[PDB]
Symmetry: C3
Subunit: 337 residues, 3 copies
């Protein structure tokens, strides 16, 4: 494909070069599958063994790791090889330098589209819409009236941006997601449900990522807010009026119900469920499949689940669980006449 010298690659991550700076490199690769023209990284000493044996031509390493790799000659020394790696993934990433407006697209005459944005085939952009510089909007995607997309944004295919959602800069949203959809609002009467119109929108901050097949609903009256730097994997449900604080990560298949606020720097593992009208403090980490039903006021790590059981062990465990309510537990832990 296309080649990079080691010296350039070390300079790019602002690291100390060791070994022949003029060596060619085609790609990044894992320890196991790397070859000579491949640059790789050693993430802590758990991976020393795979490193020692790797056929990779150079190594992104910590200084205390370089000492444990005499077998090897060419290095890039940095304090955080993982972040240096992360930077360089983009150098090797094959880039979409595409620009201009595909003639099958339907852009309402009132919309402002930067001359360096890309609008895909069969994209539809409505009244008062704005798409910023170097923004990429892929094919079939639709932008409803009054939707604004900032700079350096990536929006893939079959994404719906509606409810006049407003997106800042460096926002990326993957295929088949819905931003700004009509949330689940229903009033009961005569044992039937009256639909509640949904009159709010969505604010989406800078540097925010959203996976595929996600549903981010627009607020019922105010806004659903995804603060700066929030990251969200595939198949997440974010209900109306959810407010997600800065740099919070939400793993695949989490569900955050209506009007809940999640603090800054929170980490939710796969398939957590958070009920409605709750606050979750800053710096809360929830492990896989946590069911949150009350508030969380203290920072920390929280969990729910029974863990894994062999099936028979399980069957008997849950029979004994069913019996616990009839057992006075603490009133025997200290019962001795």
């Amino acid at each position: 494909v296309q080649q990079y010298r080691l010296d350039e690659l070390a300079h790019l991550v602002k690291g100390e070069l060791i070994g022949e700076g003029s060596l060619q490199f085609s790609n990044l690769a894992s320890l196991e599958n790397a070859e000579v023209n491949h640059l790789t990284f050693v993430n802590g000493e758990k991976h020393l063994d795979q490193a020692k044996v790797s056929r990779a031509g150079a190594y992104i390493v910590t200084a205390a790791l370089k000492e444990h790799l005499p077998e090897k000659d060419n290095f890039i020394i940095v304090d955080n090889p993982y972040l240096a790696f992360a930077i360089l993934t983009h150098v090797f990433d094959k880039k979409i330098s595409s620009t201009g407006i595909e003639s099958t697209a339907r852009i309402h005459p009132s919309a402002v589209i930067s001359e360096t944005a890309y609008i895909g085939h069969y994209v539809v952009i409505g009244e008062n819409c704005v798409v910023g510089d170097n923004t990429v909007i892929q094919s079939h995607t639709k932008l409803d009236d009054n939707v604004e997309v900032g700079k350096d944004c990536f929006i893939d295919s079959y994404v719906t941006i509606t409810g006049s959602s407003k997106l800042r800069d460096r926002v990326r949203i993957h295929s088949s997601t819905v931003i700004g959809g009509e949330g689940f609002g229903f009033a009961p009467y005569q044992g039937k449900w009256h639909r509640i119109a949904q009159l709010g929108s969505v604010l989406i901050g800078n540097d925010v990522r959203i996976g595929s097949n996600c549903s981010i609903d627009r607020g019922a009256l105010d806004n659903t807010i995804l603060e700066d730097g929030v990251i969200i994997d595939n198949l997440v449900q974010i209900a109306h009026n959810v407010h997600i604080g800065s740099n919070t990560a939400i793993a695949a298949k989490c569900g955050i119900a209506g009007s809940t606020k999640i603090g800054k720097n929170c980490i939710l593992a796969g398939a957590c469920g958070v009920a409605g009208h709750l606050s979750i403090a800053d710096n809360v980490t929830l492990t896989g499949m946590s069911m949150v039903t009350k508030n969380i006021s203290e920072a920390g790590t929280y969990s729910s689940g029974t863990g894994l059981f062999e099936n028979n062990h399980w069957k008997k465990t849950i029979v004994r669980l069913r019996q616990l309510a009839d057992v006075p537990l603490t009133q025997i832990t200290k019962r001795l006449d």
Copy 2:
């Protein structure tokens, strides 16, 4: 921005007016963010403090509440404020009565399309399809052969309606949703899976709402049926042959497995799992992340799950959970001699 007089708004909800019936209002708003030109609603006495402090022009309240609101002058007195509010959200909802067939739609000559319907751009409609009066079918959506949509329906973009699904009146289905999809039929032989074709369909009642990123699979032989007034949030799995009773509500991320039947007036909270070939009786609420593996014969509220735990308390809780099988429980409660 179109205005409405306070006396009309009170008439529109069958409500008693108090205050200057000629006052102008742009929109509904929340207690916290309402301005002078905004109508709002106080839902029970838990919100009085937010209400008193609010800058809302007028108030939707009950008689028992207007009393505890001396601070305010113009009200609309109704018996269920939530429902009066629900009605008025539509009056402020950005109403779209577009009509006709966009010129980039691909429609089979054999399909019957009501003159009052709207077929959007890039819409594809197959043989013997019927789209009834006043139905909106948004851009990019597809209707396979023998699919029928009734009157006054809203079908959004990137919706697949297949397997000759039959949708009645006032049915609304949101984006990235698959109605009628081939269900999960696989017979085992020689340690491989023989795919079973699926020859059924889907009956979707009047007044049924389906969210985004949902999958409603057709029957293996008969029909998957969603009865009148069923409402379904985003990210729901309805498997082949599931039958859902009238006005049952199904929250986000629920999965209902093949051939199961859920009664009338049921409520399923977020992320429930209902296993195959079961009956759930009329009038059953399940709470969040509930796991149902047997029939539910009696009405009532049901639950599964541990609570949330701080992580160390979780780890030690589950260590002790694992020991529970080997521990005589009912043979020590009656053991006092």
Copy 3:
């Protein structure tokens, strides 16, 4: 509509014909809803009483069942009726015969499209793409650059295939699915998330089926692999680098996190969550909603969850549960001296 003779059908399943060979049949159907021109099947004695009352014209039964069915004259005998039924579903399943490329498609000239393939309306096919013989790409779907799709594949609408994904033969992918989208790769620095570009791809073997609304992310450096035979239901998350063994079945709504390997012939029930960097061995069955956090290294059936509880009972249970950690359980069953 379209008619078949009983003897043809008997022959199609390598089956002993009993009764009038020349009888006409339109369709399969259930024991409950079959009419004279419907063929049906009796699956063991459990369904015998239903069969006795069926208006079905003919019955796919096994010898020791014909036995208990004197009420009925027309049969097809076979050793496994379910598999016989499955073979015949395809005979009645409406054939999708179409060939060619619709004019509303956009296909880059450097793409190779078989003359026996169908490219549906509005499809977008990128550079260096390959589409095999008899493959169907339904309307609206997109293939990005370097995507390859084998022979006899079916790929429904609003599918995104990207990340240079490679698909073998007889792969079928349902609607709203995203194959090979950027995985959840993020580095932490200064309490921010730096995005990690995702450089691998996806290999999908022969005879793989994927449901609707699924996300199958590309690998970080190496590939995400679905081996031959793998079947995956609707709404599943398969993270970057997940490796899934031949003939494994993944039920609706499962999540497998990054870098997890899953052996051959596994069965995961609906809504399981498997954590990252784990091994599950060949022949493992998980029951609905299991949470795997450690490697499972022996074949067997595994589970997690509490039972379903009536709600009051549930609340007392979790209170007792919470008390469990403070109670020594093994030190009291062995307390008698």
